[PDB]
Write a protein that binds this ligand. Structure first.
Ligand code: K
Ligand code: K
Lengths: 196, 196, 196, 196
């Protein structure tokens, strides 16, 4: 039995690897052995894990560009089959389930901040011929990268008033992201300690 | 009554949406129904929330480019009418009110650091023909993005002494921003726990 | 007496302001009134604060490009005269004095990491004609910005092995900077609580 | 004896310095005195420290480009001989040994996130002629810098769907890196307190 679990993990990892390398600038035969093994255990077994196992097989049987792209993307959920053997991924899923309200609050704060600062910078830079934001929707990406401190890149065209708005945006984003993270971190620490 | 609150939230969200999309590269009719509903509840109702409700209607009645731009910008405070229904935004406002001194201290530390490091980098790079900072005021944005770890972008023209100053600036900014944030975070956690 | 303290703070702020604006692409007369007031209180008064007061007057009396640049730079210590009236700056100075060993440890860890990763990336990218680091000393700035998460900017010329080294550098820098900061933060919180 | 330890630290630092400066765009004679002193103490002494001492001498005696590059790189472990005299480096090594599982969990979470978001952005941007990611492997560096908040640089070619994926990537990376760091930080604080 322990040898089979090693075999199953090896097959899952091989499927993940071949899934990545088939996109590089045979594969189907190896994938076929993976899909037979995937469905072979499914019938013997026959929860979220079972649903993921179903999704891991649907794109194979099915095979309008949007539909094909969607099914090709949904094929990536092979990597989530590792949750059966891995423990950290199970812990991460449990914490994500148990911290839904804080995630919603974080998204709401980010949304309020992004619309506020996008309007502010758009109006502050609307009085110049060369505008770095065509519209309020065009500035959501800039605001979300600045508030996350990932960094937009170049702020050269931005004028003096725009620079003041951007400095305020940086400080406010630092604060508003430092706000709702510790609760999620504490939940993860709780679950990890309980598991270990 | 519960249906009306759903209607009110729907109207607020519709106003926010149409406010963003009217800036994209009819709308007035929908906005008119919003402004009638906004003033209709105001008279029936007749605090910070009431003041915000007044500001949400002033730009409509009023309608020198600076004055027009200012009123168009102050029109964005429709989004703060969500504080009546939302709870997280109320919590954020309460924490911002209750942590004024720490915000002032953070701004003071940032101001001292920005002027100090701006003078340092300006003087260190004043001995070269190609200067990356024309004046001490010209370096406030660079210092504030470096100390926030958002990132300025390109430091190539910066010379060896300028690079040493910038490394010191990065380390010092990391420290001086990690200093005053935990108190604000703890205040927010306190208010959020009390509300829930 | 309270009016004089307001006057003294006003004079210090005016000196700081005029010091910044004289560098923009009269001033001496206003500065002369500042320097007379600075020396007038010094004689009446006659610690670190007293030493700073001495340094605030030395460049005036003194007035080989390096010496002139050094004295012009050391003139900026007018801003530290605010420590007499401000309390947060005193707290920051006390914490900096009381956390010397941790600052030294942080600098040592940064030094070990920067030399290690600079050698690693230099050797990994030495097998290509187009090298993004001429020498091990040339990579200290890249390593210090990557480990601080400020960001170097463009990593395009960096090859596959260089990219692996850079990913390791990012992760290791995140860890090694998250390591020694909480002690300094706790010291600052202690001093701020004691003062308030 | 205390003078010899000063001499030994001076020799180690001199070796580290000359090792860096020999790469700049005599040295062997000084290095020879270092290698004689390194082997002289080794015989008198004759653990991880002893192994490091052996590695510090192997490249000298040995002296196919890959082998030469590998030995030249492995010569850099002179800097780890400072662990005998320094205490912070010993503490860092002890914490790294005592926090292996959390490092593995962090690498696993980063791996899952990087493959997931690389597939997501690659599929979202596969419907345009100008693609910012040739393949799923080509996006690991972008995902790892975005999730670490170091910053990739320019996101201009990235389209609307790609921008939504990138915003999700930034938020998720912030969370998933804030998750497993506090345990390592607490371990380091424990070891540092015990040592002091
Ligand atoms: K950054
Ligand atoms: K950052």
């Amino acid at each position: 039995a322990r040898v089979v679990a090693i075999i199953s993990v090896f097959v899952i990892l091989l499927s993940i690897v071949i899934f990545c390398l088939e996109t590089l600038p045979p594969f189907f035969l190896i994938e076929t052995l993976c899909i037979i093994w995937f469905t072979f255990e499914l019938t013997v077994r026959f929860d979220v894990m079972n649903v993921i196992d179903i999704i891991a097989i649907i794109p194979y049987f099915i095979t309008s560009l949007a539909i094909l792209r969607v099914i090709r993307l949904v094929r990536v959920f092979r990597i989530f089959k590792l949750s059966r053997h891995s423990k950290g991924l199970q812990i991460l899923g449990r914490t994500l389930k148990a911290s839904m309200r804080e995630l919603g609050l974080l998204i709401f704060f980010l949304f309020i901040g992004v619309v506020l600062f996008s309007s502010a910078v758009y109006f502050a830079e609307a009085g110049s011929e060369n505008s770095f934001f065509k519209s309020i929707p065009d500035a959501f990406f800039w605001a979300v990268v600045t508030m996350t401190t990932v960094g937009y890149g170049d702020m050269t065209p931005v004028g003096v008033w725009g620079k003041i708005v951007g400095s305020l945006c940086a400080i406010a984003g630092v604060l508003t992201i430092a706000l709702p993270v510790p609760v999620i971190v504490s939940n993860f620490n709780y679950f990890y300690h309980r598991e270990t």
